Design a protein around this nucleic acid. Structure first.
Ligand SMILES: Cc1cc2nc3c(=O)[nH]c(=O)nc-3n(C[C@H](O)[C@H](O)[C@H](O)COP(=O)(O)OP(=O)(O)OC[C@H]3O[C@@H](n4cnc5c(N)ncnc54)[C@H](O)[C@@H]3O)c2cc1C
Length: 456
DNA sequence: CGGCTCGCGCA
DNA sequence: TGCGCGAAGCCGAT
């Protein structure tokens, strides 16, 4: 659909039909940003070719009732800043509430939309909303992958077993898809309140707030300033101050050596392609640059590949055959300790290292990448069954992580519990051939006393 | 057949 | 801390 700096492989048709005479409607869900957004850039080009304006619609669902205030407040502040950003580009942002399957379809008829465009995501709830919209609309419906550098359906056409099989496929398509972003052109033709939806949502999530003994909330909201502008500043600080030592202090939770981009990368407040662009041109350590590029390209996008080709990505069935047979044979193995969901949530286990990992999750909403493995693998070692371990790990991850309800989470949990994108290891009790990690192994890699003392 | 994103013994 | 090895099942390049 026209465009010079626009690769058509980033778009795909969801429903054919006659193009209406109305403006182009962008159903922004996953990539909540104005700059470096293919789904918005493609929506502007179609609008320019049809001599119509472009509008942005966001549907707020009841999904926030499953999470807490930490994710609702982080995402809502970004949309308030996003509202002003599109206003400067003469693009109006319309915020709806309810089921997108009925709210978007009613929107299309009411506003007399001519073309509908949405961003891509492999989650189950989005494939459902899309199909309900398809049955209720009669205009063309497009979908753009503005989250992955290479489109998910283009990098691979199947579920990738391991990264060493996905690495050469992704890196072979980098010279084509890794490109600069054209600027967003404001509209030529011009045509509720977010403050009220924020106050209404917080009042409903108040009883479920995580508290201390003295009724003092646990979440510390000053660690990550939300929004598109603050996401850019985090990237600049990481490249200038943290990219050099990234390859050596990657797995040390006592050091703040990570990029801290996942809360912004999840909500779409920042483009991973933009991060990859800035990293490629920076002069830094080559082992550090390779280590970071493998994280944000190979492993961030193979998580989308995992969810796109495995609909049960959050279930025991998605595990490989060797893992399922191994964990099934150890179901009757006596376990050293049995902790319920409440004991894991409050951090009341016998392991001070595990409790400290949960404390960081409860206080900052973002646990260190290395400790997230020990946090999830010890849940499997201290649960009733593999199904309960998957249930508990997903519950705490999606409730308290600022990057929860993400394909990176379900792939990361399935990696730690089900050996997805992993291999077999030494045979043990309970866990079987799943990769084992011990408290003593962490003692030889970093100062565990500092990490425990930092979070009680 | 070669090589995959732990623990462990040893400088 | 940094390195080489062990224990394990399977992809995929042929
Ligand atoms: C059990 C488990 C659960 C996880 N839960 C989530 C989750 O809900 N949301 C989430 O965003 N990440 C999750 N991950 C991945 C990883 O823990 C985080 O992406 C990372 O810790 C975020 O911190 P960072 O951005 O500073 O990391 P950095 O080292 O700065 O990494 C930069 C980016 O690379 C990507 N990345 C890094 N490590 C991974 C990984 N292992 N898998 C996939 N992408 C990765 C992320 O997009 C991240 O923002 C989980 C991993 C595990 C093992």
């Amino acid at each position: 659909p026209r465009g010079s700096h626009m690769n058509p492989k980033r778009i795909r048709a969801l429903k054919s039909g006659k193009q209406g005479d109305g403006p182009v409607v962008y159903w922004m869900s996953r990539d909540q940003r104005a700059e470096d957004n293919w789904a918005l850039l493609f929506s502007r080009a179609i609008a320019k070719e049809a001599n119509v304006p472009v509008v942005v619609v966001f549907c707020l669902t009841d999904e926030f009732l499953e999470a807490g205030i930490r994710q609702y407040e982080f995402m809502l502040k970004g949309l308030q800043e996003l509202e002003v950003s599109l206003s400067r580009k003469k693009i109006p942002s319309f915020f709806l509430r309810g089921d997108p399957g009925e709210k978007i379809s009613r929107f299309v008829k009411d506003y007399n939309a001519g073309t509908l465009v949405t961003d891509f995501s492999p989650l189950r709830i989005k494939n459902q909303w899309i199909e309900k919209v398809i049955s209720g609309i009669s205009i063309p419906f497009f979908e753009v992958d503005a989250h992955n550098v290479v489109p998910c359906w283009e990098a691979s056409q199947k579920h990738e077993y391991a990264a060493h099989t996905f690495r050469p496929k992704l890196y072979a398509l980098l010279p084509e898809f890794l490109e600069e972003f054209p600027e967003l052109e404001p509209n030529s033709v011009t045509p509720e309140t977010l403050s009220d939806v924020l106050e209404t949502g917080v009042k409903a999530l108040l009883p479920e707030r995580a508290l201390l003994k003295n009724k003092d909330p646990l979440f510390e909201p000053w660690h990550f300033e939300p929004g598109e502008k603050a996401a850019k500043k985090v990237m600049e600080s990481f490249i200038a101050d943290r990219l050099d030592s990234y390859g050596a202090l990657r797995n040390d939770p006592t050091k703040n050596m990570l990029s801290n981009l996942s809360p912004y990368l999840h909500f779409g407040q920042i483009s991973s392609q933009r991060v990859v662009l800035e990293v490629e041109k920076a002069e830094s350590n080559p082992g550090s640059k390779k280590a970071f590029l493998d994280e944000i390209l190979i492993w961030k996008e193979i998580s989308d590949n995992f969810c796109y080709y495995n609909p049960g990505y959050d279930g025991f069935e998605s595990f490989p055959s060797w893992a399922k047979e191994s964990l099934n044979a150890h179901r009757n193995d006596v376990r050293s300790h049995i902790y319920t969901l409440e004991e894991f949530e409050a951090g009341k286990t016998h392991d001070p290292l595990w409790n400290a990992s949960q404390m960081e999750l409860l206080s900052t909403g973002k646990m260190h990448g290395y400790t997230r493995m020990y946090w999830a693998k010890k849940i499997l070692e201290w649960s009733e069954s593999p199904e309960k371990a998957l249930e508990i790990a997903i519950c705490l991850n999606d409730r308290y992580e600022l990057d929860g309800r993400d394909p990176n989470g379900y792939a990361g949990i399935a990696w730690s519990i089900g050996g997805v994108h992993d291999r077999a290891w030494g045979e043990r009790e309970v866990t079987g051939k799943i990769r084992y990690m011990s408290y003593e192994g962490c003692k030889r890699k970093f100062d565990v006393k500092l990490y425990i003392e930092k979070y009680s």
